[PDB]
């Protein structure tokens, strides 16, 4: 029951969202994995530019 001058809100939490929460605790380890893969690619192509063509 809305009362005494708030916003007329529409929250999208009517589905089963707690089963589908995507927590992002992976992402600093994912930055480490992307860094290691990028350094491995740069060591693979040794005279070539590391970014690409």
């Amino acid at each position: 029951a809305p009362s005494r001058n708030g916003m007329i809100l529409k929250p999208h939490f009517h589905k089963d969202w707690q089963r589908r929460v995507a927590t992002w605790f992976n992402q600093p380890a994912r930055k480490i994995r992307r860094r290691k893969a990028r350094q491995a690619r740069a060591r693979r192509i040794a005279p070539r530019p590391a970014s690409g063509p």
């Binding site: 001058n5 708030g6 916003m7 007329i8 809100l9 529409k10």
Partner: protein, 187 residues
């Protein structure tokens, strides 16, 4: 039994600043002493406006400071603001100033020190004029916040100009029944 209405026996004014910042507390101590010793009301107003909150001391703009200090009679005068001095980029020329404030932004400070003015703090203002002689005490726009556009008389009501709390403005979120004479009624 005595019939005192005890609803308003406790005055709800500020006695001390709610913040825990030690430079502001030292300025508060110095203006406490100046308020309960000096006979001037300037130190009391400075202490009362050092008591207030951040949304209660509004930022004062540089062009309004130029406007209020180019009034006649206040030559050789200083401008004491108990909030912050913010720069306006839409003013071109700036004269010599003597500005006392809690905090001046970097662009306004560079503009005043390039124009040749002086920027004092409150301890330097107390060392210069302890009774507050040669001062004009200014304050920024109090009703200038967006929060006051939603206050006062309620919307959905005739002769009211209150901004309603809308999550996103547009065509189909409002301006229908309650705002159109075609859809039932307008106000």
């Amino acid at each position: 039994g005595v019939d005192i209405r005890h609803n308003k026996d406790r005055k709800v004014r500020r006695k001390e600043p709610k913040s825990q910042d030690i430079y502001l507390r030292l300025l508060v101590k110095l203006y406490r002493f100046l308020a309960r010793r000096t006979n001037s009301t300037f130190n009391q107003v400075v202490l009362k406006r050092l008591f207030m909150s951040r949304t209660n001391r509004p930022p004062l703009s540089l062009s309004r400071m130029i406007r209020k200090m180019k009034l006649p009679g206040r030559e050789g005068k200083t401008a004491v603001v108990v909030g912050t001095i913010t720069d306006d980029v839409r003013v071109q020329e700036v004269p010599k100033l003597k500005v006392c404030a809690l905090r001046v932004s970097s662009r306004a400070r560079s503009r005043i020190l390039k124009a040749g003015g002086k920027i004092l703090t409150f301890d330097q203002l107390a060392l210069d004029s302890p009774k507050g002689c040669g001062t004009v005490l200014l304050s920024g726009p109090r009703k200038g916040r967006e929060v006051y556009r939603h206050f006062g008389k309620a919307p959905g009501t005739p002769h009211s100009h209150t901004k309603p709390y809308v999550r996103s403005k547009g065509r189909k979120f409002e301006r229908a029944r309650g705002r159109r004479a075609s859809r039932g009624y307008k106000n």
